[PDB]
Amino acid sequence: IKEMPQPKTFGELKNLPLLNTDKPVQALMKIADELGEIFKFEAPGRVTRYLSSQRLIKEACDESRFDKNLSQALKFVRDFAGDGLFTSWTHEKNWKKAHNILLPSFSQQAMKGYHAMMVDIAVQLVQKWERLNADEHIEVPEDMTRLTLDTIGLCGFNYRFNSFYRDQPHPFITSMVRALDEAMNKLQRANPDDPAYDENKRQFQEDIKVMNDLVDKIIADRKASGEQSDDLLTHMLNGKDPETGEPLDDENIRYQIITFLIAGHETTSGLLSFALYFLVKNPHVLQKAAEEAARVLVDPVPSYKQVKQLKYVGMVLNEALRLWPTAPAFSLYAKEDTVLGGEYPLEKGDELMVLIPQLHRDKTIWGDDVEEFRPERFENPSAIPQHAFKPFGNGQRACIGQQFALHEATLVLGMMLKHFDFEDHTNYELDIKETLTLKPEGFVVKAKSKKIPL
Ligand SMILES: CCCCCCCN1CCC[C@H]1C(=O)N[C@@H](Cc1ccccc1)C(=O)O
Ligand SMILES: C=Cc1ccccc1
């Protein structure tokens, strides 16, 4: 039985001021570097334990002993995402009900049905880059956000955000980003009801109304469509829980739409941004991925079957999720008194945070070269220890969108590598912006067309 270390404290504020930074996940990774596989982190009236080793996280992933917890970040996001799938407790009726109703929207048959609309948006991205002038550059995270928002809008809801028709972010995005930054900034506040934050609260409520106004319009656009969609919104409005026999009610549907619009794009745009970053910093890897794209994508319009054959592009995306998992933590609570790693006794209700980027740097798993971008690490899933690689979370509360995100990202990165040579013209220094999620900031490249027709 060991006592766990704890980072520096600030009297009655305990560890809370360590979150007073624009890059709190990166700050917690540096604390994990110093303190090791487990540390205690306290705020007034609250306690959690940050896990960084596969040795402890494999036990935390035992669903008989630990369930999904709402982190403070998720409690703040619940102000607008309610009892949607991401911010519901496992024991809330609406979690298993929505899970049962929406899981078929991510079947192989559903993915084949989404493919053509993913191609619609991917082609808009390729055309945008084909149409840039000499020595114009690409704003990578900006364009990846245009693509991933438009893809979830069109595939999920038959709604066109038309993000490639805008030089400024879609108003949905401006409000969503400001809501997430507010949720992140609020983590450090000991006295959140201090009138000093009255303006923050006004702006937050304004951003929530902007997101609900867009949901209103999507629900209206479908009500009056009088056309046969069989998409995510079809299942939300018409699907029945095989268990309870009931459909989702209007309040829960609104929360699911907000949830899928945010979760269905923010993390995928980060993944694509980090993937292109690693490819231009690792030219040998880029060449191998581009050779696969050229050999497989033999038609002007990629097919579902062809994207499934981009195996190396799939490994590039897993290796980008290893180094910078874009949803960089998840939280667990102990269902009963238990002992972690034979050393750390926990009581029922005790909370854990899984620090995913630090898990993915465990030298006992990946070897000494852990900072190197090597997609070949993923050649054989059987050679990776259990729970070493957790970018989609765990168990029945794992990402419902995993195959959607990876199909989209594989299709898009395949078309990017088929159609362009990329240049890191600024020798970009990686700068990771935090909005709860992680994304490169200020990442720019030049794309020289290979002049291959669409
Ligand atoms: C939206 C998908 C990503 C969510 C990631 C959330 C993960 N946080 C994103 C920012 C930092 C990181 C995190 O460690 N947060 C803890 C912070 C906290 C711990 C103890 C007491 C008070 C507050 C939390 O929110 O509880
Ligand atoms: C439900 C909120 C959310 C926010 C960011 C990423 C994924 C999900």
From Swiss-Prot:
Query: Per the record, what is it used for?
Result: This protein is a target of protein engineering. Its selectivity-directing and activity-enhancing mutations have been extensively studied and the designed mutations allow this enzyme to act on non-native substrates and/or in order to enhance production of synthetically desirable end-products.
Which annotated residues bind heme? C399
Impact when changing A263C:
No effective fatty acid oxidation. No effect on electron transport from NADPH to FMN
Q: Where in the cell is it found?
A: Cytoplasm
Q: Reported effect of changing A263 to H/K?
A: No significant stimulation of NADPH oxidation induced by addition of fatty acids and no hydroxylated products, but cytochrome c reductase activity levels are identical to wild-type enzyme. More negative reduction potential with dithionite
Induction and repression of expression: By pentobarbital. Expression is negatively regulated by repressor bm3R1 at the transcriptional level.
What effect on the protein does mutating A263M have, as reported in its record?
No effective fatty acid oxidation. No effect on electron transport from NADPH to FMN. Slightly lower high-spin conversion with arachidonate, palmitoleate, palmitate, myristate and laurate/dodecanoate
Please give the annotated consequence of changing A81F.
800-fold binding affinity for laurate as substrate. High coupling of NADPH consumption to laurate formation. Very much more effective in indole hydroxylation. Favors omega-2 hydroxylation
Q: Where is this site: Important for catalytic activity?
A: T267
Q: What is the effect of changing A263Q?
A: No effective fatty acid oxidation. No effect on electron transport from NADPH to FMN. Nearly wild-type level of high-spin conversion with laurate/dodecanoate, palmitoleate and arachidonate
Q: What are the boundaries of the region Cytochrome P450? A: 1-454
Listed binding positions for (9Z)-hexadecenoate are Y50
Q: Which family does it belong to?
A: In the N-terminal section; belongs to the cytochrome P450 family.
Task: Give the protein's biological function.
Answer: Functions as a fatty acid monooxygenase. Catalyzes hydroxylation of fatty acids at omega-1, omega-2 and omega-3 positions. Shows activity toward medium and long-chain fatty acids, with optimum chain lengths of 12, 14 and 16 carbons (lauric, myristic, and palmitic acids). Able to metabolize some of these primary metabolites to secondary and tertiary products. Marginal activity towards short chain lengths of 8-10 carbons. Hydroxylates highly branched fatty acids, which play an essential role in membrane fluidity regulation.
Report the protein name in the record.
Bifunctional cytochrome P450/NADPH--P450 reductase
Whole-protein residues included = 3 to 456 of 1049
